Ligand binder design. Structure first.
Ligand code: ADP
Ligand code: ADP
Ligand code: TPP
Ligand code: TPP
Ligand code: MG
Ligand code: MG
Lengths: 533, 533
């Protein structure tokens, strides 16, 4: 006969215990009980977005920067389906995002309820099943606690990923016992390497004449920046990153090879494909297409390929491994450090990036969209701070960075947050700067305004002999005016001097800002030629 | 040894035979062979949109207005997932929309390909399965013709609905035999009622003292407007429509009851729930929540319920039927006519709508979005022309009408096309007005700008005691400035006199136009109080 709360309040309180601070989303009729519970608790802050997709991107960005669980909510039917791309990006980047969706009342199942979201209508649980680690409808109020804890355990254990919890509106306000647990009670710790593997890796490094490390996005998921650095310095092993793993290692460090793979650096290409690397250590990379120059066989080391991954299904997928370590990257690096120590043995886009480099403070978190910004950002921007380069290459969704940067700023309010994005990507999700204006979230968007789809335009020229154009706008979008309409200060930049001033002004603001940069659509970005050939 | 074409060209030619005139979408690397084929044939025209969701909405609007198949295309991964909401609305409204998605080349399956869209990545085929009649990956170039015909047959047969065809990029340019068929060779006709059921309905009508017809959106799917009108006039039976079925029967006609159900008219409510209707004929309605005032038992007739539906699974779902006719609505009505004849026996939103009624030509196609616009359009606008009221109430996705109106105008270029939409819905998909500017598509958007989520705000007041606000913008969006930024002429209207002038100007343009109307968020729309109780 214990203390009761509503099922949806229990859910909110259990999220509190996980350190959730924001819920991104858009309300709707069957979702209102969740908002009622949030506003009654006055701890988690709801963020109203313009599109549920932007809500999901924001939760994804909040999660990646905070290292915590991101949470978004959407209503029945088209609310939840609008979130899908963002959940699919969290899925492809191994980001823990919880999507809470509403469901009609049980008494209306199979009758043609408004936005019915069951097997009889638009089956949200089945739609999200392929791109979540778990997609389930809460069957009864009594199971809310167990299912919530299950979702939280599943999102953040093993390879992190998103969760979809669907909540019938009548279940939401049923009374349940107030049963909230600390996170350590309902999820376990991280896997470590075996003693044998540590000793074998140590020995391989001791005898290696040209070892190398390829560090991927798993370094960020494992929060292993300081261990990777210590390990690299203790051994003298040079470190390349994958494109998405950029900022896992300080690119100004003497041991940094830069980025290997798409839009990468000749320094890394020469070191890793020259045939001289005898021991290659892959840490937290899935070794997909862009990470390997389309599975280039020259990546194969001459003595041993060591691959460290928390997901056992990634080990040896595309390259045969000699030491396949199923463990968390941070636990592995710590063990390796323990073993080795104890032993004792328009404007040219490049100018834009350069100008950004000269003005952005060192602690800036840089979000980069998908488009030619990828090449310019990955290739030309020097990332010195751990985790400060945020790019969603798993799915490479246009508009991801446009919205994710807002969630990032909420996760790191003390740090400058800048997003480098294309104009077509900004047309997809740029309305979200209104969300930044509404909540006074200071982010700076730099729009490479080349009047259309640059990467597609170059593909038409280089692969289809300019036979057709389905990439250039007849009239460019005026982002300054668009920003103005959404209540966000803006600057237009047609020269480097103009850009430098704009950036300078933007950084000093305590509100959001947009910089519309004039850029030529014909400019060939770094690495695209090789990619075309 | 007969002529061969590429698989993707075969697909384009087979869509030509179905009368497809536009393909809405956004290009991407694996999708480019489709665009190459389209541009080489110069009959189907590609329409570049701002978001793949807007492309799916446009295909949906094109399909509903044209009575033909709508086609949208998206690239791998996030391109396709961005379309999902629009496809889900086609599914909920029984609209034939074909979504063509690209897939990576087969040689990269399971290796971590860029935007890999297989079971090993983001599994598009399984994601779309719940909201399509068919979702399949073309396994070989040789099967392109059969799979295409299968898709076209499936979309437009039985209860119409959307299809997802996923095309591996390497298959796209393999040679295949040039084999194109007219639609009648690979899909059949419509089913008719049995003579026994026709005679039974005729007898029930001949003896009925207070008959009524409730006509739904199936009337449009069957293109049965003239047969419905002739049937009602022949029998003297008054006709109500469902909300979504509005414009299936001329609302100025002496036999019109108006709309029954959500935001409907008292005339229809009095007639149908009085208990005096003895024979009720439901034609092409799924009898969901809004169609039945939450399955009101008083809708039950006292003698006989007759239900006509092409989908046998809808017949008798929520109300027991006495005559359940599985047939096309147009074939059934023609049969009934043949039998009976042979026998021989801010600004207040209501003022906005009145001004629209006071200027719009009779042939105007009115798209109404989802939001309080539903209530104002359904209740206050008098629809006289068959099919000229276009509302997507199956899923009621915000932003649907914003984009669907562009496809509608392309389907009926000689007719005025106007969209009545809320400001939050325009923030979700309003960027598509740049698509209308790019192609010079004259559509008029009327934005009810109440500075936030009107229906949600009223729900907070009437169901949650104004305890919280997650609905009002701190600073409303300036849609005239946004339109200007996107190259679209615009007007701001704060009085009915300004609005009338704006509409007049808008109708005379041969370019798109946006009208930003000041509206009080507090006004209670017709039918809301009833829904609240
Ligand atoms: N905590 C962790 N420790 C080690 N590996 C991890 C951890 N979290 C995620 N991973 C792994 O890191 C990899 C990330 O791959 P991906 O997201 O494709 O980035 P990249 O583009 O750098 O390969 C996955 O193979 C995943 O299993
Ligand atoms: N050609 C047709 N003839 C008869 N009924 C049809 C036809 N096409 C679709 N239908 C039916 O019309 C109904 C449409 O229901 P719905 O889209 O919910 O509209 P409404 O809101 O008017 O009920 C479905 O039950 C579908 O099976
Ligand atoms: C949602 C989505 N649709 C399509 C693509 C395919 N795509 C990759 S780059 C590109 C063009 C991006 O244009 P813009 O953002 O203006 O950048 P630019 O390359 O011109 O700098 C497109 C459509 C994608 N990645 N995501
Ligand atoms: C994609 C989507 N998200 C959420 C909802 C829930 N919803 C119904 S009405 C409404 C408010 C719409 O606001 P606006 O378009 O400005 O219209 P208003 O009611 O203020 O006229 C919302 C969010 C929805 N129907 N579709
Ligand atoms: Mg561009
Ligand atoms: Mg509104």
């Amino acid at each position: 006969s214990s203390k009761t709360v509503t099922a949806v309040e229990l859910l909110v309180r259990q999220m509190e215990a996980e350190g959730v601070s924001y819920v991104f989303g858009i309300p709707g009729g069957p979702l209102m009980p969740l908002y009622e519970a949030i506003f009654s608790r006055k701890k988690i802050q709801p963020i109203l977005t313009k599109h549920e997709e932007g809500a999901a991107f924001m939760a994804e960005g909040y999660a990646r920067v905070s290292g915590k669980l991101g949470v978004c909510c959407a209503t029945t039917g088209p609310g939840a389906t609008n979130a899908l791309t963002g959940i699919a990006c969290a899925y492809s980047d191994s980001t823990p995002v919880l999507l809470l969706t509403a469901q009609v009342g049980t008494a209306a199942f199979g009758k043609g309820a408004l936005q019915e979201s069951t097997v009889h209508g638009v089956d949200l649980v089945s739609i999200f099943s392929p791109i979540t680690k778990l997609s389930v409808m809460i069957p009864t109020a009594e199971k809310m606690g167990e299912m919530t804890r299950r979702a939280l355990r599943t999102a953040q254990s093993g390879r992190p990923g998103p969760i979809h919890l669907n909540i019938p509106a009548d279940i939401a306000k049923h009374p349940v016992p107030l049963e909230v647990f600390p996170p350590m009670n309902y999820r376990g710790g991280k896997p470590a390497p075996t003693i044998m593997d540590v000793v074998r890796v140590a020995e391989l490094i001791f005898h290696a004449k040209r070892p190398a490390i390829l560090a991927g996005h798993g370094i960020e998921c494992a929060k292993a920046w300081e261990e990777l650095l210590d390990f690299a310095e203790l051994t003298g092993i040079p470190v390349a990153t994958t494109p998405k793993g950029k900022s896992s290692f300080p690119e100004n460090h003497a041991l940094s090879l830069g980025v290997f793979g798409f839009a990468g650096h000749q320094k890394a290409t020469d070191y890793l494909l020259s045939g001289d690397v005898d021991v290659l250590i892959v840490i937290g990379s899935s070794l997909g297409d862009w990470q390997t120059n389309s599975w280039d066989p020259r990546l194969t080391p001459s003595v041993a390929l060591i691959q460290i991954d928390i997901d056992p299904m990634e080990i040896g997928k595309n390259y045969p491994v000699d030491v396949g370590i199923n463990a968390d990257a941070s636990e592995t690096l710590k063990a390796l450090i323990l073993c080795i120590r104890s032993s004792g043995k328009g404007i040219h886009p490049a100018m834009v990036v350069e100008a950004m480099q000269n003005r952005l403070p060192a602690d800036t978190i840089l979000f980069v969209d998908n488009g030619s910004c990828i090449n310019w950002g990955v290739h030309c921007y020097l990332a010195q701070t751990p985790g400060a380069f945020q790019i969603g290459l798993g799915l490479a969704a246009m508009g991801h960075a446009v919205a994710a940067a807002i969630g990032g700023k909420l996760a790191a309010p003390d740090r400058p947050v800048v997003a480098l994005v294309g104009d077509a990507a900004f047309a997809m999700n740029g309305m979200e700067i209104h969300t930044a204006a509404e909540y006074k979230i200071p982010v700076t968007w730099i729009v490479l305004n080349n009047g259309g789809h640059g990467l597609v335009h170059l593909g038409e020229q280089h692969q289809f002999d300019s036979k057709f154009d389905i990439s250039s706008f007849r009239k460019s979008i005026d982002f300054c005016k668009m920003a103005e309409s959404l209540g966000v200060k803006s600057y237009r930049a047609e020269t480097v001097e103009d850009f430098d001033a704009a950036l300078k002004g933007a950084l000093a603001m305590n509100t959001p800002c947009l910089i519309d940069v004039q850029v030529d659509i014909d400019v060939l970005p770094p690495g695209m030629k090789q990619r075309f050939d």
